[PDB]
Amino acid sequence: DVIEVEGKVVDTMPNAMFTVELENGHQILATVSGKIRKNYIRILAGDRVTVEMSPYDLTRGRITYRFK
């Protein structure tokens, strides 16, 4: 399954992967969901996002929502 966490986009990295900083200061690696791209939603630094975490891999995640 997946758990959802919210965080701030800190760093813009190679093939559209992002560094997201959670509330507790921990940082996770994130890709962007296809739903976000095809809806012309841009993911900038400083943006707040919702990230779906693969349970087996708490290092990586996937951005499923951008606030505002």
Place this chain on the structure above:
Amino acid sequence: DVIEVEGKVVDTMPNAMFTVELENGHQILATVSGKIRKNYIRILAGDRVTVEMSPYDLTRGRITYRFK
């Protein structure tokens, strides 16, 4: 591994298990860490807590810290 989430204690349940409501409104079932008990820390309703989530089981967790 485990991921850490913060939430509010909503319900006091049977053998010292608690209902914790996370920031996103999702609710998880939680026990209390032995460190908390043996340090004479009480877990009341309305308390904010840090919960360690077993990755394989995102329904259940373990309270590892109480704020204030």
Place this chain on the structure above:
Amino acid sequence: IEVEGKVVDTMPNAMFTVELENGHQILATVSGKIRKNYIRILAGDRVTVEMSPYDLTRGRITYRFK
């Protein structure tokens, strides 16, 4: 002031569990307009929700997409 979400669960007394797009799970009532027009809401339905100013875990369904 409205958020978009999918209906996860139906509870008794016209209550609904809604998974918002932002990841939030809320407990939602239905607006007066929704009831008067006999709009049937089932699990999986996409809805718009007006959040409660007093409770951030609750809101009311203002529209059901067909």
Place this chain on the structure above:
Amino acid sequence: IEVEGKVVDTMPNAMFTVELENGHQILATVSGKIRKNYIRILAGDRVTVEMSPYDLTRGRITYRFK
């Protein structure tokens, strides 16, 4: 105003990654007193940290428990 935590990582230029008891991971410097007294801080060491008022992800180690 102090929080308790365990040293996770040592970085160059007297920087430390600290896992606080509340679950927060912060990047910590060392207080002037700590440096002057040549206090050696290693991974696994328990420390007290004064949080930064301006950055909630940063702080400074004020004491190392032996």
